[PDB]
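Appendix B. Worked example

We walk through a single record from start to finish. Start with the input: the chain for Fe-MAHF-9 A8S, synthetic construct, length 9.
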Amino acid sequence: LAEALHSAL
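Next comes the structure step. The output line below is what the pipeline stores for this chain.
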């Protein structure tokens, strides 16, 4: 999830 969030942003 950490990286999912980073990509989204």
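Two observations about the output. The chain has one helix and no strands. The longest helix spans residues 2-8.
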